[PDB]
């Protein structure tokens, strides 16, 4: 009967920066919480009430608010901070969560390395055909891939998968796969994946002609 709305869905930050993460409730509560959740771990409680640290919480975390506003604050980010963090309300029935805020490490911008792969001969026995683009080792995570077949954009049949931010180099990588029927694949020659990313004023273009070598 109340929603909670938490302000950045994402959040890039560097160690030492002073992150702030807000929580906005659709009516006045005094009982909130901020959990923290690690990639392969339970949530843990970090704030309780609106400003109580839980025992075994670093004094780096603080919580403050009232009157529908509520605000986590991380006063000088550590590597071990990087996580999701999670408001609750526990002031009326259906206890609600927020949609979670995803604090991830950051670094200098890096352009993706893009490589395009026609369907393998083995897949083309199947009647399906997948064209794969890998977009590797880029930063920031925001990237958009547009596929074209003989000049015409194709949106249906595109599947994108992203790695988690790399634990050593802080980059992201992505696979973008265009799947079509083998019959359609052999009726066209040009296949293109175009990557829009802040590191270039125009997209990186990888393209091949099916019948060329």
């Amino acid at each position: 009967a109340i929603v909670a709305t938490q302000s950045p869905a994402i959040m890039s930050a560097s160690p030492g920066e002073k992150v702030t993460i807000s929580c906005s409730a659709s009516s006045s509560v005094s009982y909130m919480y901020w959990y923290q959740q690690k990639p392969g771990s339970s949530p843990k409680p970090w704030i309780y009430r609106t400003s109580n640290l839980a025992s075994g919480v670093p004094t780096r975390f603080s919580g403050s608010g009232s009157g529908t506003s509520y605000s986590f604050t991380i006063s000088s980010m550590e590597a071990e901070d990087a996580a999701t963090y999670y408001c609750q309300q526990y002031h009326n029935y259906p206890r609600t969560f927020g949609g979670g805020t995803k604090a991830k490490s950051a670094r200098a911008d890096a352009a993706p390395t893009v490589s395009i792969f026609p369907p393998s001969s083995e897949q083309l026995t199947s009647g399906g055909a997948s064209v794969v683009c890998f977009l590797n080792n880029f930063y920031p995570k925001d990237i958009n891939v547009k596929w074209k077949i003989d000049g015409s954009e194709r949106q249906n049949g595109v599947l994108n998968s992203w790695t988690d931010q790399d634990s050593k180099d802080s980059t992201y990588s992505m696979s973008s796969t265009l799947t079509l029927t083998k019959d359609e694949y052999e009726r066209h020659n040009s296949y293109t994946c175009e990557a829009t990313h802040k590191t270039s004023t125009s997209p990186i273009v990888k393209s091949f002609n099916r019948n060329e070598c």
């Binding site: 009982y31 526990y90 002031h91 009326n92």
Partner: protein
């Protein structure tokens, strides 16, 4: 007694057979001990409901109910 809640706060529905005995119930913040000194009678239509304040090293004054770890609401009938 039946332990329920009233706006996130613990609420005690106290029956007649509990008159004169320490009321204990577990809570995240440890074990809570409320003391009921009330006209406490049989649970019926004539109920009264009010709060038992938290009292840390302070003598009670002008009250007949109080807890020592977490403020609790209490309800009991006056019938006999």
């Amino acid at each position: 007694f039946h332990l329920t809640t009233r706006n996130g706060e613990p609420h005690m529905i106290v029956s007649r057979q509990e008159k004169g005995k320490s009321l204990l119930f577990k809570t995240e913040d440890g074990v809570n001990m409320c003391t009921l000194m009330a006209d406490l009678g049989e649970l019926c239509e004539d109920t009264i409901t009010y709060k038992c304040p938290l009292l840390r090293q302070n003598e009670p004054e002008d009250i007949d109910c109080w807890c020592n770890s977490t403020s609790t609401w209490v309800t009991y009938g006056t019938c006999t």
